[PDB]
Structure formats: C-alpha cells, structure tokens
Paper text:
The chlamydial effector proteins [name] (CTL0247) and ChlaDUB2 (CTL0246), in the following termed [name] and Cdu2, were demonstrated to have in vitro deubiquitinating and deneddylating activity. Sequence alignments clearly allocate [name] into the family C48 of the CE clan of cysteine proteases. We further show that [name] specifically deubiquitinates the major apoptosis regulator Mcl-1 at the surface of the inclusion.
In situ proteolysis and LCMS analysis identified a stable [name] construct that displayed full proteolytic activity to pursue its structural characterization. The [name] (155-401) fragment crystallized in space group P21 with two molecules in the asymmetric unit and at a resolution of 1.7 Å. Each monomer is composed of a central four-stranded β-sheet, which is surrounded by eight α-helixes resembling the architecture of the C48 proteases. β-strands 2 and 3 also contain the two other residues of the catalytic triad, His275 and Asp292. A search for other related structures utilizing the program DALI indicated that [name] (155-401) shares a high degree of structural similarity with Ulp1 despite the fact that they only share 17% sequence identity within a stretch of 221 amino acids. Remarkably, however, a small loop between β-strands 1 and 2 (shown in yellow) in Ulp1 contrasts with the much bigger α-helix D in [name] in between the equivalent β-strands of both structures. In contrast to this difference, the residues within the active site are highly conserved, further supporting the notion that [name] forms a complex with ubiquitin in a similar way as observed between SENP8 and Nedd8 or Ulp1 and SMT3, respectively. The additional α-helix D in [name], a feature not observed in the other structures, however, may play a regulatory role in substrate binding or recognition. Importantly, an insertion of identical length as observed in [name] seems to be present in the [name] proteins encoded by the genomes of C. suis, C. muridarum, C. psittaci, C. gallinaceai and Cdu2 from [name] suggesting that it is a conserved feature across the chlamydial deubiquitinases. We speculate that this helix could act like a ‘lid’ that plays a role in substrate binding and/or recognition and assumes a different orientation when the substrate is bound.
Numbering used by the authors: 159 to 401
Amino acid sequence: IEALVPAWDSDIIFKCLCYFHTLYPGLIPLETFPPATIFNFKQKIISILEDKKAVLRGEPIKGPLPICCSKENYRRHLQRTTLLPVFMWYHPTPKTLSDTMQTMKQLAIKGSVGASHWLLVIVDIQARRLVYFDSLYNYVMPPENMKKELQSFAQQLDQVYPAYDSKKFSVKIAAKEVIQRGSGSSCGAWCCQFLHWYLKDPLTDALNDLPVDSVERHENLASFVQACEAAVQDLPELSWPEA
C-alpha cells in the first residue's frame, strides 16, 4: 500500500527551485546536474561561496559556471543570494564520484530510482546555519556522525565566508525520525517540501506536525507536488529566473 507520489528527478527539482526563487529571491536556484554528492558537496559549496565573494568584490567568477544561466544573470544571483539549496544525489553502492555519476546515468536510462536517494543541504548564509535533511533519517550515516562532519565543515565555512561579527555557522540535523515511511521514490519531493517550509518559517519544526500514518503523510506530499507541478508549467525551459 503506497500513496501515489511522483518521483522527482534532477530536472523537476531544478524547475521547483526556479519557482521557489521567484517567491524567495534570496534562494539561488542551483542546478541539479551534475549533482552534488557525498564526495564533493562541501567543495561545491565552498566554490559557490568563493564566487559570491568575488562578485561582491567586482572580480571575475572562478566557477564552475551554470549550464542554463548567462554569465551576467549568474552574477546577479550571486550578488543577491542568501541561501544555497544543495541537492545531493546518493546511492549506497558507488564508492567514488565517477562511479556515482555512472550509476545515476544507468538508472536514468532505465527510468528507475532503485536504491538512489536525494539529500538536502541548506546553506543559510544570512542566518549562518547548515541544515541537513534526510527523509530517511540515517540512510547515509547515523545523524550524530553527519552532525560531526558538518560541525567540522561549519568551522571551515567560518574561514571561507567570515562574518564581521565573527558569528559561527551552526548545524542542524532536521529529521528526528524516518520521514519517508512506507514510500520508495518520494525523496526529491520531500526535500523540496522541507525546503519550502524552511523558506516560509525556518524555526517551526514542520516535520513534527506530520500525520503519523504513512499514507496520509504522503498524500499530503502528493498535494504539494500537484501544486508545484502546476506552478512550474510555464517557466522558461532550461533557464534560470532573471535576477
């Protein structure tokens, strides 16, 4: 027994992020392919923050550059952005970035999700918070382990992107239990739903207010998915919103 929730791949997630930007201009709609992975999400975030610093200094971008965005529009986004939505594509089997990309490619050809999984890392620059959302709670590793990893990373970000008041990046592991209970392919949608809740209200623990019943929980997510798919219908194709 499973509520019907569409699988959201890199293309639909990106469309949703573009839509979210128009609602919350501080959100930069980072491209979802090639995706962040557990092997390079930290370095990816650092590169983006370094490029924001460069833009704020009126210096050239170092990259990497967006595929669906002009150079100038990307600079406009970096100037403005307060929040990085980093989507990490994960699979238990591959042991390197190269093998992860190969597995993703194979699964895409098959039109299958398999054991693959989307994680969300929110880098809130304005509030200086790192938020890790795993709809499966501990799929990659126990949350206490990810917390330690991200505490180390937070210290690094304090050096890469310092605050004048020397405020330190904080870390939050958002899910306190398995969220995606009884569902096999809803992780992309869950990440976007969590992201939307966070954009509306970064304090309220929306996850705690979910129905205990697995089906009702995912039928609510399906309602959210339906609302999003309608909203992104007419968004320009493979093209960032104009900042």
